[PDB]
Amino acid sequence: GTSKLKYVLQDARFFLIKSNNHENVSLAKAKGVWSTLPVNEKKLNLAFRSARSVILIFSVRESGKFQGFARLSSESHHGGSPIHWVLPAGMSAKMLGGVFKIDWICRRELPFTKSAHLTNPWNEHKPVKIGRDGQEIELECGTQLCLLFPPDESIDLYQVIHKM
Ligand SMILES: CN(Cc1cc(=O)[nH]c(=O)[nH]1)Cc1c(F)cccc1Cl
């Protein structure tokens, strides 16, 4: 092992990222991209400039689990190849912010039952599973949460470390 993982997470910032469906997480896992509404786009762009690593921890709404976590490799940007996100009824591609590039650190899931001992100081010490989309997770809680996930032996953090 966990040493390279701990190195990537050192002095990182962490954000709880919701998805409306599994399809969008699948797209993010396949293409290494994420997009948010403008309010969270501004927060994440500020964080990306502020920290050695910004970690997105993903949870599909109503799933009772986290689906993995990834590190921002870029600020948001517009104009790339369009991503066929499954948007909710009534939401248009024009309402999205730019696209963030991300490097997956773990594509394995973690059930909320396994993180019941972790509370987030930045959300009133409620269990870390609880938060609005974009809720920041304090360093220690976020580090422990990431370390609970099953190791993803398919990923090599060597190239991630070189981007820091
Ligand atoms: C790429 N994106 C997935 C996504 C979901 C979510 O709940 N939060 C989030 O930051 N992104 C499109 C989108 C939706 F499909 C639904 C709400 C907001 C947005 Cl931006």
In this structure, are strands 119-120 and 126-127 parallel, antiparallel, or unpaired? antiparallel
Bridge partners (DSSP) of residue 13 are 54
Task: Report the separation in Å between the CA atom of 81 and the middle of ligand 1, taken as the mean of its atom positions.
Answer: 17
How many CB atoms sit inside 10 A of residue 9's CB?
A: 22
CB 129 within 8 A of CB 111: no
Task: Report the separation in Å between the CA atom of 52 and the middle of ligand 1, taken as the mean of its atom positions.
Answer: 25
Confirm or reject: Cβ of 35 under 6 Å from ligand 1.
Answer: yes
CB 32 within 8 A of CB 103: yes
CA–CA gap between residue 157 and residue 106 (Å, rounded) = 10
* Superfamily designation of domain 1-164: ph1033 like domains (3.10.590.10)
CB 20 within 8 A of CB 59: no
Tokens 């469906």 belong to which residue?
A: 21
Give the residue among 133, 155, 25 at the shortest CA–CA distance from 83: 25
Cα–Cα distances (Å) from 138 to 13, 48, 71, 86, 91, in that order, read 7, 15, 16, 30, 31
Annotated binding residues, written as ranges, equal 18-20, 34-35, 85, 133
CA–CA gap between residue 97 and residue 34 (Å, rounded) = 10
Expressed in angstroms, the distance from the first to the final Cα of the chain is 20
HEC string of 42-95 equals HHHHHHHHHCCCEEEEEEECCCCEECEEEEECCCCECCCCCCCCCCCCCCCHHH
CB 86 within 8 A of CB 20: yes
In this structure, are strands 110-111 and 65-66 parallel, antiparallel, or unpaired? antiparallel
